[PDB]
Amino acid sequence: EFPVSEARVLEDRPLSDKGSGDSSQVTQVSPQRIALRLRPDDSKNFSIQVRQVEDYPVDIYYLMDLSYSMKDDLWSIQNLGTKLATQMRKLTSNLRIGFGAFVDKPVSPYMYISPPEALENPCYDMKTTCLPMFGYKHVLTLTDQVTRFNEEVKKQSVSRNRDAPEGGFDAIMQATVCDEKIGWRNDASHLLVFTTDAKTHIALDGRLAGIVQPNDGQCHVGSDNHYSASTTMDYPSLGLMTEKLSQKNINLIFAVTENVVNLYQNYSELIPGTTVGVLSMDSSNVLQLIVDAYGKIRSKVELEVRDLPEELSLSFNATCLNNEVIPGLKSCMGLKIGDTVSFSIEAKVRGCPQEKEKSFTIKPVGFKDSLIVQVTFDCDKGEMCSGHGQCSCGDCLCDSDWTGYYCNCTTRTDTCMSSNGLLCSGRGKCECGSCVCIQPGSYGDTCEKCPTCPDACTFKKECVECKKFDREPYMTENTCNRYCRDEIESVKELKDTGKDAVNCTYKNEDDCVVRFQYYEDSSGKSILYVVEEPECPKG
Amino acid sequence: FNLDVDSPAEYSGPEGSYFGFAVDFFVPSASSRMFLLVGAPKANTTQPGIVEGGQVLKCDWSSTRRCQPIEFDATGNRDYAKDDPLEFKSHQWFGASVRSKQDKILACAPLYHWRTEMKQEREPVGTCFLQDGTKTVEYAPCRSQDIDADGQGFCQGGFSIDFTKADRVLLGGPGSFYWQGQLISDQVAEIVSKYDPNVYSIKYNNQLATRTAQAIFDDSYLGYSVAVGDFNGDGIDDFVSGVPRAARTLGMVYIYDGKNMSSLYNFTGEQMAAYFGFSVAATDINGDDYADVFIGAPLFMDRGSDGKLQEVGQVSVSLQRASGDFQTTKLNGFEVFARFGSAIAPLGDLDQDGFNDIAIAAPYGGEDKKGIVYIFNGRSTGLNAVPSQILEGQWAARSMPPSFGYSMKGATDIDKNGYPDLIVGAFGVDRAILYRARPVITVNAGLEVYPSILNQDNKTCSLPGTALKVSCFNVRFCLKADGKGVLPRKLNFQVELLLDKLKQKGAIRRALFLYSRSPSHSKNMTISRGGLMQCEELIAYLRDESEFRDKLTPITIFMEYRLDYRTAADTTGLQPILNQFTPANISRQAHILLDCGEDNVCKPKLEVSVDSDQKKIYIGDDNPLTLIVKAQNQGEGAYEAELIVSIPLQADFIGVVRNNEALARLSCAFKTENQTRQVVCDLGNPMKAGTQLLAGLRFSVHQQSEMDTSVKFDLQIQSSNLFDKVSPVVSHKVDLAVLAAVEIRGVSSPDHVFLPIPNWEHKENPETEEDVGPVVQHIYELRNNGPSSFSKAMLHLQWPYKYNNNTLLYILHYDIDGPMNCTSDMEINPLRIKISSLDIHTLGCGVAQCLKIVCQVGRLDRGKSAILYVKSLLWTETFMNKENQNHSYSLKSSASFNVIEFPYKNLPIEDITNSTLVTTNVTWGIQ
Ligand SMILES: *[C@@H]1O[C@H](CO)[C@@H](O[C@@H]2O[C@H](CO)[C@@H](O)[C@H](O)[C@H]2NC(C)=O)[C@H](O)[C@H]1NC(C)=O
Ligand SMILES: *[C@@H]1O[C@H](CO)[C@@H](O[C@@H]2O[C@H](CO)[C@@H](O)[C@H](O)[C@H]2NC(C)=O)[C@H](O)[C@H]1NC(C)=O
Ligand SMILES: *[C@@H]1O[C@H](CO)[C@@H](O[C@@H]2O[C@H](CO)[C@@H](O)[C@H](O)[C@H]2NC(C)=O)[C@H](O)[C@H]1NC(C)=O
Ligand SMILES: *[C@@H]1O[C@H](CO)[C@@H](O[C@@H]2O[C@H](CO)[C@@H](O)[C@H](O)[C@H]2NC(C)=O)[C@H](O)[C@H]1NC(C)=O
Ligand SMILES: *[C@@H]1O[C@H](CO)[C@@H](O[C@H]2O[C@H](CO)[C@@H](O)[C@H](O)[C@H]2NC(C)=O)[C@H](O)[C@H]1NC(C)=O
Ligand SMILES: *[C@@H]1O[C@H](CO)[C@@H](O[C@H]2O[C@H](CO)[C@@H](O)[C@H](O)[C@H]2NC(C)=O)[C@H](O)[C@H]1NC(C)=O
Ligand SMILES: *[C@@H]1O[C@H](CO)[C@@H](O[C@H]2O[C@H](CO)[C@@H](O)[C@H](O)[C@H]2NC(C)=O)[C@H](O)[C@H]1NC(C)=O
Numbered sequence A: 001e002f003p004v005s006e007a008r009v010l011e012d013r014p015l016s017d018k019g020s021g022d023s024s025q026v027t028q029v030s031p032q033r034i035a036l037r038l039r040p041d042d043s044k045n046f047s048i049q050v051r052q053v054e055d056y057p058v059d060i061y062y063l064m065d066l067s068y069s070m071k072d073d074l075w076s077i078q079n080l081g082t083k084l085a086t087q088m089r090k091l092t093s094n095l096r097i098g099f100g101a102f103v104d105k106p107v108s109p110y111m112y113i114s115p116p117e118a119l120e121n122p123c124y125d126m127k128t129t130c131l132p133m134f135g136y137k138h139v140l141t142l143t144d145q146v147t148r149f150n151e152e153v154k155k156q157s158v159s160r161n162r163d164a165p166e167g168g169f170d171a172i173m174q175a176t177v178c179d180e181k182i183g184w185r186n187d188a189s190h191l192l193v194f195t196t197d198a199k200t201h202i203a204l205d206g207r208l209a210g211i212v213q214p215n216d217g218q219c220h221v222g223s224d225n226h227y228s229a230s231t232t233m234d235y236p237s238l239g240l241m242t243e244k245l246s247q248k249n250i251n252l253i254f255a256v257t258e259n260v261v262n263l264y265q266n267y268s269e270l271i272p273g274t275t276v277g278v279l280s281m282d283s284s285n286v287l288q289l290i291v292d293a294y295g296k297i298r299s300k301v302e303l304e305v306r307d308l309p310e311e312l313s314l315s316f317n318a319t320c321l322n323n324e325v326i327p328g329l330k331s332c333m334g335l336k337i338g339d340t341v342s343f344s345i346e347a348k349v350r351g352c353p354q355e356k357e358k359s360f361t362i363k364p365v366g367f368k369d370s371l372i373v374q375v376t377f378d379c380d381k382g383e384m385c386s387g388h389g390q391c392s393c394g395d396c397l398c399d400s401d402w403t404g405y406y407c408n409c410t411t412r413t414d415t416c417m418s419s420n421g422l423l424c425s426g427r428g429k430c431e432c433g434s435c436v437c438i439q440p441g442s443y444g445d446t447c448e449k450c451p452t453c454p455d456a457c458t459f460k461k462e463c464v465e466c467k468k469f470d471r472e473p474y475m476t477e478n479t480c481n482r483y484c485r486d487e488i489e490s491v492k493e494l495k496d497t498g499k500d501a502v503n504c505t506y507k508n509e510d511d512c513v514v515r516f517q518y519y520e521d522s523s524g525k526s527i528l529y530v531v532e533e534p535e536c537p538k539g
Numbered sequence B: 001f002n003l004d005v006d007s008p009a010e011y012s013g014p015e016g017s018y019f020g021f022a023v024d025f026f027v028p029s030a031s032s033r034m035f036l037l038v039g040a041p042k043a044n045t046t047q048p049g050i051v052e053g054g055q056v057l058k059c060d061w062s063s064t065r066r067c068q069p070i071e072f073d074a075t076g077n078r079d080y081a082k083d084d085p086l087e088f089k090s091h092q093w094f095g096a097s098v099r100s101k102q103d104k105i106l107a108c109a110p111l112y113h114w115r116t117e118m119k120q121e122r123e124p125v126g127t128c129f130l131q132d133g134t135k136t137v138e139y140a141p142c143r144s145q146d147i148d149a150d151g152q153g154f155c156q157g158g159f160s161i162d163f164t165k166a167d168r169v170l171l172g173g174p175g176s177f178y179w180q181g182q183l184i185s186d187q188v189a190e191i192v193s194k195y196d197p198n199v200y201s202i203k204y205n206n207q208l209a210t211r212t213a214q215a216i217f218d219d220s221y222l223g224y225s226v227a228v229g230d231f232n233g234d235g236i237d238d239f240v241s242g243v244p245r246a247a248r249t250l251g252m253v254y255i256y257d258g259k260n261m262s263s264l265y266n267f268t269g270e271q272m273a274a275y276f277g278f279s280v281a282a283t284d285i286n287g288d289d290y291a292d293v294f295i296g297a298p299l300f301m302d303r304g305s306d307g308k309l310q311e312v313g314q315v316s317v318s319l320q321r322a323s324g325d326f327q328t329t330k331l332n333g334f335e336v337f338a339r340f341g342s343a344i345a346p347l348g349d350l351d352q353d354g355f356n357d358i359a360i361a362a363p364y365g366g367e368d369k370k371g372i373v374y375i376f377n378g379r380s381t382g383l384n385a386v387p388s389q390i391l392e393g394q395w396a397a398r399s400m401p402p403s404f405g406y407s408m409k410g411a412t413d414i415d416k417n418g419y420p421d422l423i424v425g426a427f428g429v430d431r432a433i434l435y436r437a438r439p440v441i442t443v444n445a446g447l448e449v450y451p452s453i454l455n456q457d458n459k460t461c462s463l464p465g466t467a468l469k470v471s472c473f474n475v476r477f478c479l480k481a482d483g484k485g486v487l488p489r490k491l492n493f494q495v496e497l498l499l500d501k502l503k504q505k506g507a508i509r510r511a512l513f514l515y516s517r518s519p520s521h522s523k524n525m526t527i528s529r530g531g532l533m534q535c536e537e538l539i540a541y542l543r544d545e546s547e548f549r550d551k552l553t554p555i556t557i558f559m560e561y562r563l564d565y566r567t568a569a570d571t572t573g574l575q576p577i578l579n580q581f582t583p584a585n586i587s588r589q590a591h592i593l594l595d596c597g598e599d600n601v602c603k604p605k606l607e608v609s610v611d612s613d614q615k616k617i618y619i620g621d622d623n624p625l626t627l628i629v630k631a632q633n634q635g636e637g638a639y640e641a642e643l644i645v646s647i648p649l650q651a652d653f654i655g656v657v658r659n660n661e662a663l664a665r666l667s668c669a670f671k672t673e674n675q676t677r678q679v680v681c682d683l684g685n686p687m688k689a690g691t692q693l694l695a696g697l698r699f700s701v702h703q704q705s706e707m708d709t710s711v712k713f714d715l716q717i718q719s720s721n722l723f724d725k726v727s728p729v730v731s732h733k734v735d736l737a738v739l740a741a742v743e744i745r746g747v748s749s750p751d752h753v754f755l756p757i758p759n760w761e762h763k764e765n766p767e768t769e770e771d772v773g774p775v776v777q778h779i780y781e782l783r784n785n786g787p788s789s790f791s792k793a794m795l796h797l798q799w800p801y802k803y804n805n806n807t808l809l810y811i812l813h814y815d816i817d818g819p820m821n822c823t824s825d826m827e828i829n830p831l832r833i834k835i836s837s838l839d840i841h842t843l844g845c846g847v848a849q850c851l852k853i854v855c856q857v858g859r860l861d862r863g864k865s866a867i868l869y870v871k872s873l874l875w876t877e878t879f880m881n882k883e884n885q886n887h888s889y890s891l892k893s894s895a896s897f898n899v900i901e902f903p904y905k906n907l908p909i910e911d912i913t914n915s916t917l918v919t920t921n922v923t924w925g926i927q
């Protein structure tokens, strides 16, 4: 023998809803360290927990489009900052606040060229003078003075450009890689609100303007606070934006106007962990937009890896509700700020290679706290051995993120995605990438389809008999909250008029007739209007 | 697949002049020597007041490397008035695009700014310049009278250029109209024969050009990249142009025709912001003359094993079917962040195999973002997805990334030899490189030993030193090697012969050469001609019995062979390379006579049987199939015994069965060498005598469908024996069957309506849904799940309707999804009730009068369903709040189905049927 071990090493414990932690150095992830000595071809298991610590300090950077159309916008936003704090105060003690402005690369085809020189200065045609072209200006780093925000902003002036699509991806990048200027707190919840009404320049668009150097991803600002390489460096690729977003734990929010909404969602679908919120024409809607995303931001625990030797492979079996588990996943949604979850990982090397510290990390997307795992290896014609398909020799040792005898099977769940996020629409189980529906009379890649399945008025029934009656199942399995995410409410006598939702009716344990209504609009609504005082048998 | 990389032509340019941003081969018909064209935007010039007008350098192949400029325009900025230029040439990026016919070369400047003739301005319309040895004319198809962005003011034409077969320059301007972009194709000798140095417009005769599209189409960037080829009927090439921002950043790729300029085929990217269209190319990748489109999406993000998105890019490779349609495929990049389809450049034949190659390029790939060039080859099957080679850049970085491979051209042969060439451009280090393709020698070997069977007590060749007559056996090796270009006359090969290779470092090597003893003989040959196998033979013997144990482990002879240099051209020799798919290893087997006595030779009796168990493979899905084989040798010895399992097309071999104890784990292995598929198994070299094998062979037959009715395999054993070398072939057909588990799910939406109904008035004569009652919606779904799909079936639905001449669940209409049609024996919605405008409980047919809706289905494959969506609504006359007990009703609906016809015919079909009922209970809930 030569036992494989997983000696835990450092482990402050989750800081039970203690964001302002007075010298308790706030921790959200259970064991801040650990170490495993893997022998050849042997695996080892270890748990990992992470919590959404209450009263966690927020950092919010206001990056808005400064095009002429953002005239009305810059009006009902000057009052913000102060208006913002009051709402965010009921969610955090230390709230940092910053601002930033962009429009588009101040250059040749995007900028108003240089027709008369009487143009490098204004919006000449229409008599309404404005500021020249800038692209990315940084005014007001993140500070305490939520009022001082109202200052800079009232002092902000609009501009104008020829091209419809603005050059924001450039800003979104600097306002991230440039931590020092922006002032991002280490232990804090970073936010980057991105407001706009127009399309946008992606990478390679800048070839027209004569820019062939691709975004390096570095911080490019000078003493003056204007993105210096704007005119000499192409817009960043959707991927580099990603790589850098995760690396600085910045949360991108897309507050955009309905006209260009649907477009920014697919950009989100490519930038995981990104949030999109329907912004307003006048932009007053902005805070009730920010304070909504925060919720979304802190309601998921996507566990992310980093580095990790090729030889060892991690397998997860997440669990985020009353110890009922869900083998395969390594993330969780539907959590309220303060809840704790665990994951349980499993390292495993395919034939110990050569030594070194080999240290990789593990942590949830967005968090600073992480589980640093330092691995060490205690181990110091043909070959019908297969059928191939990544399958090696010996007698078929599958590769990382590949399982099964033939090495047929996968470890991927992304395939088993869905619109609502939940694995296999919640009617089936992910099996080697492809869902295998626990058939209630349904089908489809993710079991999405089920024309034969009972109307929602039979799915929600259990919800109003729970969150409004303290009865029925889910009240029994303790899964009434995390599950019935829906926000019910008692309708003052009669209910809604809006014919864009459905009204139900049913008999409760009490033999009374409940009448409710399932609705859903603007920013992902789903209220369950319940007529107060059901009709019970009189006597 | 193989170009030289030992010593390629290193062409350089000035610091910061983007030397190499655009490349091409100059091949004037007026001279015998070809040249190199290298764009150099950002290159200072001797034009008055013009800073970085860029230039174009003509580089000579003549091993000197002196390559300085091309006299295009030396005139500075023209004037419209005194102190106000008409044009601005400074920073015009002249050189960004460089094409060239023969003697004809078109260079452009996509950032050429012009003042309008109207008000003061500086719009970037761009211009091109077409030289012709002597005559040089300016070509600005966008300098039209119309200006501003709403017109061709920011056109930036010349962004991309290209000549057609019959000379007709295709050209692009990504900013035309509102950055929609546009293509312009103008005849050459129209462009020349219309040039008037005193006009800034020039109406062109036979000009082809695209129109302004609708608003929604803005910022699409048509003409961002362009290629030309024939995609419609016969004749002239058509216009292929990539629009990276088409759709919603999805990117599209249009193909207009070279005569009407009318739109033909379109292509669309699958992912947003990937720049599907950054580059394109048309070339026949599979030798059958039909141009094949290749479209680059350099920023594409695929999925790694870990499931996360990686930015590596893909190259959509669409093959052209003679039917006008396409058989598109895809090919992803290798590293992350190195754009991959960043620059497609089809070559000719870096192998002359009769199929064209192509070189995709990742300008940021390799270590230190030095960029590499993967050179995929072509086959009739399409394009072989495996980089036959990778051109690794070798330039550091001075100010920005080298961008090696960002621009490249290859299709003309600059040197002597009959093989193409390639020019790559690394403009980050300001340079372009010439890769010379090498000669491809294909060489056949061939070797065989004389007596194959050895007799220990054989006395024929006297030993070297002494004269002890010993058991002789000779072996002769030979080979032919014919090229296909500048190389022949002295294909000299270094061959090697080895005896008893199966013998490791153990040294029980019982075979040596005559005049010299050792199992290793060295030798070098030569050749040249096509069919002149220059040969040679050697005498080899066998060690005495009294000095080695054996028991038969074939004395295998071995042959290795390799070329040598100084087998090439004068101007620095280009060493050939043997074709990649040809082995420099051949070896035969020698045995020793053993047990092959009495008659003196081995004559085996061979047989293979099969039980034909589990005979059933349902049409449709992956049907697992195992074959229990019984290989038997009943005669004498049998060398190189082996099983030949001939499987069908839709066969596919998995492995030999180990999971079962009682079976043999043969050294089987699937193979296709000739136009035949077959599993080959080692049945023991000398399969002894009376030896019996019984292994299992598993597969997975793929459906076909009306393949008549049965799938057969063909079994036969064979061996290298001289007599009775095989066995009577045994065939085995496995029968295809039909199974289609169709089911009928059904469901009522408001399955339970509580009758006291919230505020409802009894109307005399109704007109709307609100006047009648609550909607009740029955949904019926017929779904075929079974592997076998069906071709025709019937759906019968009985609906309630009335009861005692009283309506119940009045139908408004029905809808269908999938291959199905229906008919109600009665008129649906008589009262024509449009939308809002502003006998116990069970009522299931037999009790009530039916409204029968009959439906005709036809073609529900493996996993497809057909659905009927009925939308009724309680008439609410389910009242009678009086007399007996109007309490509890059911309103039953029922629908059955019958599968009447399948596609397969020769297989025994069985009618598939069943039914399902759907209730909607209307109860009195409070009372
Ligand atoms: C071409 O010459 C010019 C001037 O001699 C060089 O730079 C221009 O002028 C100054 C000189 O440092 C630069 O700061 C400007 O950026 C250039 N002009 C403009 C309008 O930007 C330029 O570097 C030289 N180009 C090459 C390739 O050597
Ligand atoms: C290929 O794509 C283009 C653009 O989407 C299509 O062209 C448009 O067709 C509509 C139909 O009437 C016209 O009104 C627009 O003016 C066209 N837009 C542009 C930019 O040309 C084209 O029809 C598509 N399909 C094919 C087969 O070419
Ligand atoms: C001779 O033995 C074999 C015959 O080709 C070579 O070994 C490998 O053979 C496989 C064929 O399945 C090729 O894929 C490998 O590329 C071969 N190995 C190498 C290193 O190329 C072996 O190379 C040969 N050696 C000589 C000297 O002829
Ligand atoms: C409507 O009521 C009928 C019966 O009144 C239900 O049908 C079955 O009724 C018997 C009563 O003895 C039950 O035992 C069965 O379980 C019932 N079947 C089912 C599927 O529940 C019928 O279910 C009711 N309609 C609906 C939509 O539930
Ligand atoms: C890969 O996975 C499949 C999953 O079943 C396995 O093969 C199966 O093939 C059919 C489904 O594709 C099943 O009906 C068979 O029972 C099963 N057959 C075998 C030999 O396992 C198998 O693990 C892999 N496929 C193959 C061809 O080996
Ligand atoms: C069921 O929902 C519809 C709306 O989806 C309710 O209709 C509302 O609007 C109608 C016209 O716009 C009005 O005629 C209704 O009075 C109004 N409902 C209320 C409660 O004000 C409909 O009424 C709902 N069903 C019932 C029985 O109220
Ligand atoms: C009709 O439906 C299915 C076949 O797809 C089968 O249904 C019967 O099988 C089970 C019996 O306990 C259950 O799944 C069903 O409730 C049951 N239905 C009935 C009415 O018994 C059945 O084999 C099929 N019958 C036919 C003739 O095809």
Ligand SMILES: *[C@@H]1O[C@H](CO)[C@@H](O)[C@H](O)[C@H]1NC(C)=O
Pocket (backbone or CB within 6 Å): A262, A263, A265, A266, B248
């Ligand atoms: C983005 O998502 C929408 C969602 O409906 C879908 O049509 C497509 O994937 C994209 N559409 C647009 C307009 O970007």
Ligand SMILES: *[C@@H]1O[C@H](CO)[C@@H](O)[C@H](O)[C@H]1NC(C)=O
Pocket (backbone or CB within 6 Å): A045, A316, A317, A325, A327, A328, A344, A346
């Ligand atoms: C997942 O399943 C359980 C969950 O804890 C456990 O066995 C382990 O974590 C995983 N499976 C294996 C075989 O390790």
Ligand SMILES: *[C@@H]1O[C@H](CO)[C@@H](O)[C@H](O)[C@H]1NC(C)=O
Pocket (backbone or CB within 6 Å): B260, B262
């Ligand atoms: C060209 O003519 C029209 C479009 O201009 C079109 O109907 C036709 O198919 C095109 N091709 C030919 C050969 O006429």
Ligand SMILES: *[C@@H]1O[C@H](CO)[C@@H](O)[C@H](O)[C@H]1NC(C)=O
Pocket (backbone or CB within 6 Å): B451, B453, B454, B455, B456, B458, B459, B460, B471, B472, B473
């Ligand atoms: C001797 O060599 C072989 C091998 O032992 C033997 O079979 C044969 O009798 C002799 N050679 C010839 C040519 O007969």
Ligand SMILES: [Ca+2]
Pocket (backbone or CB within 6 Å): A069, A070, A071, A072, A073, A280, A281, A282, A283
């Ligand atoms: Ca606005």
Ligand SMILES: [Ca+2]
Pocket (backbone or CB within 6 Å): B230, B231, B232, B233, B234, B235, B236, B237, B238, B257, B258
């Ligand atoms: Ca044509």
Ligand SMILES: [Ca+2]
Pocket (backbone or CB within 6 Å): B284, B285, B286, B287, B288, B289, B290, B291, B292, B319, B320
């Ligand atoms: Ca073809």
Ligand SMILES: [Ca+2]
Pocket (backbone or CB within 6 Å): B001, B348, B349, B350, B351, B352, B353, B354, B355, B356, B357, B377, B378
């Ligand atoms: Ca080729």
Ligand SMILES: [Ca+2]
Pocket (backbone or CB within 6 Å): B413, B414, B415, B416, B417, B418, B419, B420, B421, B436, B437
């Ligand atoms: Ca050549």
Ligand SMILES: [Ca+2]
Pocket (backbone or CB within 6 Å): B595, B596, B597, B598, B599, B600, B601, B602, B603, B636
């Ligand atoms: Ca014999």
